[PDB]
């Protein structure tokens, strides 16, 4: 019974553009898209949380609250699975999917509630590692690259 | 051009792959880079080494050789679905329906004596699964047998089981012709795939820029004959790990021995021509009458039959470009002595044919009593064995200050 | 070690204290002397019981041959006039019903003096006999020795640093 | 649900029309539920514990081998009997015995610094001699015929081979609390929990 | 096979003397006994005691007219334990030896073995041997560890 | 009955060997295995030499089969060394070396026997029955 509502909800998601210029998902060709990019990221220094969280809080505006997480000194490799990477008009973009969303049923999911969810679930570190991995990938692949 | 990279260890092949990627960059950034592996740990180690060398390792696809070959079948030749109609479970469920219909034949009286004694549909599914696994092995390895069984003619010189295997396969090919399933499978497609690449003038679209074959030491001749036609158009880099630097395979004919003697490798960095055999004038005396080379090292002759067949299958390719990057190991330790004896293709085992070689014992290699490279341990139980192993690994970690448990 | 677990092994000195003890088979399960097939007689016929007891005695003789031929240097046997019958003094003993007494008394029923004369008849340089003496003087001597000093090695540093290939979920 | 629907989809892909019993689907689900393997932590950084997997040779500094006795390794998989590939072998044919021998060769070559080999030689039940595999026997034969100790420089060929094979063979004790392991010398145990048990200096 | 390579020729002659008293000693017509021959390399094997050279087979005849089962087992177990402690007490002083030609070996506790048929008489031998401060192992013990 | 020589035994038809207690039965099995591998005996020999996967040895105890396999492997290695050296220290091995005329082909056959020792057909009774039931399952009717 959920299927005829599910297909119209999927088409309503696909018709909604997600860009600062208004680019929808239907304008992306097969060569432009890449789904589930798996990356390995090396690190040779002991990852100190105190030297990293201050560097994040120096530039990221969402780190006003969010008291810092505690983790051990991690030296080695880091795995990651990016949901979607796509290019458009000579510009690369990243796309991830979050779909739990249990506590909202009304139209209260504004930018403030989404920013509070990003600060609560701590997806800022994941997005920053995704930007670092995408920057290293576009630096290794494309010659004469600017961020 | 098909490039073949012979090396003793895998780090030289990883450095050569790094030099290939840094030398020639991809024109399409979102194009995945095909690196053919066999297991997940091999792909994981390749991802970790490419991330260590480049700073990143992403958009690198590691498919199976059969999956990559079927993907190239889909991309080159049209009207082919993404999945094969002839799979193991599909042929098992087809043969479970086809075998009761074929019990009335005279050729299937053995299966009738095996099946009609007692059947709660248990022996039928086991026979269908085993015959489907054998048919999958025939689709991978023996396409000529299935091509002759599709017409209905027998092959001279096979076993008795062909007497029930030739009408069982052909009635399978009719059955997928009877249903809405497609006709095409792996056996009948490889010859058309080889011919349509040799007969074409322009390259077909959709093909990748460069394909890597790393960590793979066993392939059928059908897959290599397809990859030769694939490498005639698109540059494919084959990184093959061989323990010996000389030719240590078999031979086919004396007219093929001269063709192998005319082929010479060249170094990747030194760019100098190096021969295959240690002696070119005495190369004919090494091979036997049937075509097997008398390998001097007994361990390589006794353990490396799969690599001995694989280097013979690689040397049989016409348009193959062979490159050798062998880093020599200085024989100081016992393990380095064994690796140097395998790589240099020499026999250090003293048989003692004469009494002068049997009396003296200083003609062998000296082994230091502190050399703990190769040790053999006798234990009494599986608990005590790993209990000894834990203490020995602790001693090895204490002996070397720079030693990672990841490297163990 | 039992006789079945000593087949194919090797022992320097072998002591056989209960080689004269025998057990009578009661069930009637024998083999025919012509067809060589297993015949099970459910009725208590005396011929089937005797034909099963003959195979039981042959099995006891084979056990005796297995147990005797495992010694290398010296073997010792325990012989006694054992009577399986409930009568104490009946004038005859049941050693002829065993495996050792069938070779000692040549398959003939005799007495304890007859068993002693049959033992003393086959006396050579390799085969001798003595009486069983009940007596103990001292158990043993320990003769212990001291133990040398021994220690265990200790690892100086940590075995490994915190090296692990994780994801975003491992850091959260 | 995924395995059940996959089994029914693979059955209906061939359009099976006849009846199918319950025990066949039960045995098929029991076989498919145990088919899965895990290899996620193969090279995470801790020391790797895995079986010998063919066509996977990675260079390591220390390579240890366990269970190299006879019968256990090489893993023998008997042919079906009615297979025609076993009757007339070709070049590209693959067998599990040759794959295990090539795996042992790749384990010998892939070892960089240290090679450890341990096999069960004595039985824990009846103290019976358990012979090692043919590959390890050929390896120790080539070691004894290719190398010699500096103590006996020129004694014999077979005697020096047996002396090398006895010097390499470390016959460990049956029990961990034996004082032979804690004797100072070449090999010494790192188990400090059995050290007062081996010292025999405890109250009864 | 004519030649026997395991035992001393005294034990071989004792076996060929005991089993060739009558014809068809194994009581079946199709099972014949033949006198085996000892080895040439093992013809100097001698189990020597403190007194003199001990013979091969020593049939310890328990004296008496008629005896029971448990009393005979107890007396022969005590005689066997006395012989074991006499072989071990004189063996640790260099008196009882195993001599191959001129080579000699002292008799340890692993050389003497008691051959029984049942578990009850094995426990009887072990109880009669542990009373004289002699430890003994049972190789044929097939009891489960979960029943202790 | 007659005496048994391991180098003069006719390997035709059915033969009954009665190995007494303490005799070298395990040595005689290895001697007959080397005789069947190299094809020795002359007129009383096998009509053709056989490989390792064609010699069937049946022993009940599994540990006895493992011990016999190890002893046959050691005998194969010792006879290969004695054939490469054309000399030995054992009299039965001396007569075995005296029975063959060629040395290189026998040494190559012993090397191939040493390499094929893992695929030796030395099984138990129930193991041989299970292998024959799983191998030729059609005529037998086994799952």
Short mmCIF file of C-alpha atoms in Angstrom, two decimals, chain A residues 19-97:
data_model
loop_
_atom_site.label_atom_id
_atom_site.label_comp_id
_atom_site.label_asym_id
_atom_site.label_seq_id
_atom_site.Cartn_x
_atom_site.Cartn_y
_atom_site.Cartn_z
CA UNK A 19 22.10 23.77 -5.40
CA UNK A 20 22.75 27.48 -4.95
CA UNK A 21 21.82 27.97 -8.63
CA UNK A 22 18.90 25.52 -8.74
CA UNK A 23 20.30 22.34 -10.31
CA UNK A 24 18.10 19.26 -10.03
CA UNK A 25 19.18 15.61 -9.98
CA UNK A 26 17.62 14.87 -13.39
CA UNK A 27 20.22 17.04 -15.17
CA UNK A 28 23.08 14.70 -14.17
CA UNK A 29 24.20 12.25 -16.86
CA UNK A 30 25.64 8.79 -16.26
CA UNK A 31 29.25 9.84 -16.86
CA UNK A 32 28.92 12.78 -14.45
CA UNK A 33 27.62 10.72 -11.51
CA UNK A 34 29.55 8.32 -9.31
CA UNK A 35 27.71 6.43 -6.56
CA UNK A 36 29.35 5.06 -3.38
CA UNK A 37 32.94 6.24 -3.78
CA UNK A 38 35.12 4.26 -1.38
CA UNK A 39 38.28 6.03 -0.22
CA UNK A 40 41.25 5.19 1.99
CA UNK A 41 42.94 8.18 3.64
CA UNK A 42 46.43 7.87 5.18
CA UNK A 43 47.65 9.60 8.33
CA UNK A 44 51.18 9.23 9.71
CA UNK A 45 50.89 11.50 12.75
CA UNK A 46 49.14 10.54 16.02
CA UNK A 47 45.70 12.13 15.66
CA UNK A 48 45.29 14.35 18.73
CA UNK A 49 41.69 15.39 19.37
CA UNK A 50 42.70 18.63 21.10
CA UNK A 51 44.88 19.78 18.19
CA UNK A 52 42.14 18.86 15.69
CA UNK A 53 39.00 20.22 17.40
CA UNK A 54 40.55 23.67 17.87
CA UNK A 55 41.50 23.73 14.18
CA UNK A 56 37.91 22.78 13.31
CA UNK A 57 36.46 25.42 15.68
CA UNK A 58 38.77 28.10 14.24
CA UNK A 59 36.98 27.99 10.87
CA UNK A 60 33.73 26.00 11.13
CA UNK A 61 30.81 28.17 12.37
CA UNK A 62 28.76 25.15 13.52
CA UNK A 63 31.31 24.40 16.29
CA UNK A 64 29.99 27.14 18.61
CA UNK A 65 28.40 24.51 20.83
CA UNK A 66 29.15 20.77 20.46
CA UNK A 67 31.66 19.87 23.20
CA UNK A 68 34.49 17.84 21.71
CA UNK A 69 34.47 14.08 21.28
CA UNK A 70 37.23 11.94 22.79
CA UNK A 71 39.11 9.35 20.74
CA UNK A 72 42.52 7.70 20.91
CA UNK A 73 45.57 8.59 18.82
CA UNK A 74 44.73 6.99 15.46
CA UNK A 75 47.68 6.46 13.10
CA UNK A 76 47.19 4.55 9.87
CA UNK A 77 44.34 4.44 7.35
CA UNK A 78 40.77 5.75 7.38
CA UNK A 79 37.95 4.20 5.36
CA UNK A 80 35.04 6.13 3.92
CA UNK A 81 32.03 5.59 1.66
CA UNK A 82 30.70 8.76 -0.01
CA UNK A 83 27.14 8.37 -1.29
CA UNK A 84 27.32 10.43 -4.49
CA UNK A 85 29.85 12.62 -6.32
CA UNK A 86 28.66 14.54 -9.38
CA UNK A 87 29.95 17.27 -11.67
CA UNK A 88 27.90 20.08 -13.22
CA UNK A 89 28.97 23.04 -15.45
CA UNK A 90 32.61 22.27 -14.67
CA UNK A 91 32.16 22.17 -10.89
CA UNK A 92 32.26 19.16 -8.57
CA UNK A 93 29.71 18.51 -5.82
CA UNK A 94 29.21 15.96 -3.05
CA UNK A 95 25.93 14.43 -1.86
CA UNK A 96 25.18 12.29 1.20
CA UNK A 97 21.98 10.70 2.48
#
